[PDB]
Amino acid sequence: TSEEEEKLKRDQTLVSDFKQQKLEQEAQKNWDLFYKRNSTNTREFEELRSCREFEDQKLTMLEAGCGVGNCLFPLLEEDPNIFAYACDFSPRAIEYVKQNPLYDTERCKVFQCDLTKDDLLDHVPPESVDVVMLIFVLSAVHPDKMHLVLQNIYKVLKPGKSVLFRDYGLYDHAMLRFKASSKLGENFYVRQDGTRSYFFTDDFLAQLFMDTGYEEVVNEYVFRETVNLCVPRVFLQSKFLKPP
Numbered sequence: 001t002s003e004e005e006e007k008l009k010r011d012q013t014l015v016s017d018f019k020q021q022k023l024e025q026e027a028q029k030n031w032d033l034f035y036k037r038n039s040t041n042t043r044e045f046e047e048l049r050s051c052r053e054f055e056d057q058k059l060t061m062l063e064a065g066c067g068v069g070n071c072l073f074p075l076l077e078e079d080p081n082i083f084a085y086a087c088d089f090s091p092r093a094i095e096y097v098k099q100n101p102l103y104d105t106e107r108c109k110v111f112q113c114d115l116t117k118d119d120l121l122d123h124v125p126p127e128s129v130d131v132v133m134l135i136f137v138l139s140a141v142h143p144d145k146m147h148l149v150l151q152n153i154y155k156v157l158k159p160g161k162s163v164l165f166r167d168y169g170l171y172d173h174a175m176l177r178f179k180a181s182s183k184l185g186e187n188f189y190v191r192q193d194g195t196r197s198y199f200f201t202d203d204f205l206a207q208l209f210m211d212t213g214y215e216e217v218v219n220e221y222v223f224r225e226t227v228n229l230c231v232p233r234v235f236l237q238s239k240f241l242k243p244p
């Protein structure tokens with residue numbers, strides 16, 4: 001190898017770490033910019049009706065990474081005996097959740113929170129929650145910090161109740177198009193809008209949850225289609241239990 005060949009490889013590491021840190025430093029900005037630049041923004045129901053002891057028993061629920069509430073307001077409208085804590089670290093997204101007319105404070109408490117560093121106990125009482133919902137959120141978090149998210153959620157969960165996980169899986173469509181310029185690491189990619197996407201394997205995700213004290217209930221790939229002309233989709237869909 002040349003002298004410039006050797007130089008270029010140490011340059012690649014250096015620039016790539018610069019890129020990674022900038023992307024991590026601005027995780028919140030890029031998600032906030034995402035919301036400020038757009039507005040065209042069932043397994044869950046089954047498990048809510050599952051842990052109920054009575055028939056119409058009230059349950060309390062934490063939607064971690066609520067966005068503008070696409071997975072929140074439906075669950076509130078179908079089920080009347082459910083209270084949802086909701087957080088997100090994008091202020092603009094929070095405005096949207098507080099701003100649409102379905103928002104009723106007898107049913108829904110939304111707050112800002114960076115799940116990697118802000119204590120959920122600041123706004124969610126300890127071991128108070130029956131279901132936490134991590135839907136397409138963990139994959140936005142740096143793989144090295146994902147366990148922080150799971151540790152944080154742990155404090156909030158009533159023992160014997162569970163996290164409902166769903167996120168991008170191995171060989172999902174986006175992973176199969178990113179130019180290697182956008183690869184940040186193994187299964188870790190950056191989108192054009194600066195937000196990041198991790199593509200989970202069943203084994204890696206299971207290890208994350210067990211390293212932070214959960215037990216595997218369900219951990220399976222699920223496959224779906226999107227219309228263009230059909231696009232194959234791979235999600236990882238799981239359920240992890242906080243032990244009693």
Ligand SMILES: C[S@@+](CC[C@H](N)C(=O)[O-])C[C@H]1O[C@@H](n2cnc3c(N)ncnc32)[C@H](O)[C@@H]1O
Nearest residue numbers: 031065066067070071088089090114115135140
């Ligand atoms: C693709 S949206 C998913 C929203 C929602 N779970 C749903 O079902 O539609 C990803 C959301 O995760 C949020 N997010 C990413 N990292 C976060 C973090 N560290 N703490 C809190 N929210 C985060 C972003 O603000 C964004 O709104």
